[PDB]
Amino acid sequence: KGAIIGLMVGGVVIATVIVITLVMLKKK
Amino acid sequence: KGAIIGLMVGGVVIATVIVITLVMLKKK
């Protein structure tokens, strides 16, 4: 039951990724 | 079944939010 949810908070990790690439475009 | 998953892609929306506030700090 809890294992299924672990997928929800999992995708939220995509946020930091989106920002990480952006941090590269900020200085270029 | 599909309704439960709709929660997964749901949180992913938190990404745009995080970026939105950042876009404000970029020019200030």
From Swiss-Prot, chains A, B:
Residue spans crossing the bilayer: 4-24
Site (Susceptible to oxidation) residue list: M8
UniProt PTM comment: Proteolytically processed under normal cellular conditions. Cleavage either by alpha-secretase, beta-secretase or theta-secretase leads to generation and extracellular release of soluble APP peptides, S-APP-alpha and S-APP-beta, and the retention of corresponding membrane-anchored C-terminal fragments, C80, C83 and C99. Subsequent processing of C80 and C83 by gamma-secretase yields P3 peptides. This is the major secretory pathway and is non-amyloidogenic.
Result of altering V19I: In AD1; increased amyloid-beta protein 42/40 ratio
Outcome following mutation: M8L: Reduced lipid peroxidation inhibition
Superkingdom to which the source organism belongs: Eukaryota
Marked site: Cleavage: V13, I14, A15, T16, L22, V23
Region (Interaction with PSEN1) residue spans: 1-24
Impact upon substituting V19M: Increased amyloid-beta protein 42/40 ratio. No change in apoptosis after caspase cleavage
UniProt-reported outcome of changing V19 to C/S: Unchanged amyloid-beta protein 42/total amyloid-beta ratio
Chain positions of site Implicated in free radical propagation: G6
Tissues expressing this chain: Expressed in the brain and in cerebrospinal fluid (at protein level). Expressed in all fetal tissues examined with highest levels in brain, kidney, heart and spleen. Weak expression in liver. In adult brain, highest expression found in the frontal lobe of the cortex and in the anterior perisylvian cortex-opercular gyri. Moderate expression in the cerebellar cortex, the posterior perisylvian cortex-opercular gyri and the temporal associated cortex. Weak expression found in the striate, extra-striate and motor cortices. Expressed in cerebrospinal fluid, and plasma.
Compartmental location: Cell membrane; Membrane; Perikaryon; Cell projection, Growth cone
Entry's induction text: Increased levels during neuronal differentiation.
Disease linked to the protein: Alzheimer disease 1: A form of Alzheimer disease, a neurodegenerative disorder characterized by progressive dementia, loss of cognitive abilities, and deposition of fibrillar amyloid proteins as intraneuronal neurofibrillary tangles, extracellular amyloid plaques and vascular amyloid deposits. The major constituents of these plaques are neurotoxic amyloid-beta protein 40 and amyloid-beta protein 42, that are produced by the proteolysis of the transmembrane APP protein. Cerebral amyloid angiopathy, APP-related: A hereditary localized amyloidosis due to amyloid-beta A4 peptide(s) deposition in the cerebral vessels. The principal clinical characteristics are recurrent cerebral and cerebellar hemorrhages, recurrent strokes, cerebral ischemia, cerebral infarction, and progressive mental deterioration. Patients develop cerebral hemorrhage because of the severe cerebral amyloid angiopathy. Parenchymal amyloid deposits are rare and largely in the form of pre-amyloid lesions or diffuse plaque-like structures.
Family to which this protein belongs: Belongs to the APP family.
Quaternary context: Binds, via its C-terminus, to the PID domain of several cytoplasmic proteins, including APBB family members, the APBA family, MAPK8IP1, SHC1 and, NUMB and DAB1. Binding to DAB1 inhibits its serine phosphorylation. Interacts (via NPXY motif) with DAB2 (via PID domain); the interaction is impaired by tyrosine phosphorylation of the NPXY motif. Also interacts with GPCR-like protein BPP, APPBP1, IB1, KNS2 (via its TPR domains), APPBP2 (via BaSS) and DDB1. In vitro, it binds MAPT via the MT-binding domains. Associates with microtubules in the presence of ATP and in a kinesin-dependent manner.
Any further remark recorded for this protein: Chelation of metal ions, notably copper, iron and zinc, can induce histidine-bridging between amyloid-beta molecules resulting in amyloid-beta-metal aggregates. The affinity for copper is much higher than for other transient metals and is increased under acidic conditions. Extracellular zinc-binding increases binding of heparin to APP and inhibits collagen-binding.
Function recorded in the entry: Functions as a cell surface receptor and performs physiological functions on the surface of neurons relevant to neurite growth, neuronal adhesion and axonogenesis. Interaction between APP molecules on neighboring cells promotes synaptogenesis. Involved in cell mobility and transcription regulation through protein-protein interactions. Can promote transcription activation through binding to APBB1-KAT5 and inhibits Notch signaling through interaction with Numb. Couples to apoptosis-inducing pathways such as those mediated by G(o) and JIP. Inhibits G(o) alpha ATPase activity. Amyloid-beta peptides are lipophilic metal chelators with metal-reducing activity. Bind transient metals such as copper, zinc and iron. In vitro, can reduce Cu(2+) and Fe(3+) to Cu(+) and Fe(2+), respectively. Amyloid-beta peptides bind to lipoproteins and apolipoproteins E and J in the CSF and to HDL particles in plasma, inhibiting metal-catalyzed oxidation of lipoproteins. Promotes both tau aggregation and TPK II-mediated phosphorylation. Interaction with overexpressed HADH2 leads to oxidative stress and neurotoxicity. Also binds GPC1 in lipid rafts.
Domain-level remarks: The transmembrane helix undergoes a conformation change and unravels partially when bound to PSEN1, facilitating cleavage by PSEN1.
This protein's name: Amyloid-beta precursor protein
Organism: Homo sapiens (Human)
Region of the whole protein represented: 699 to 726 of 770
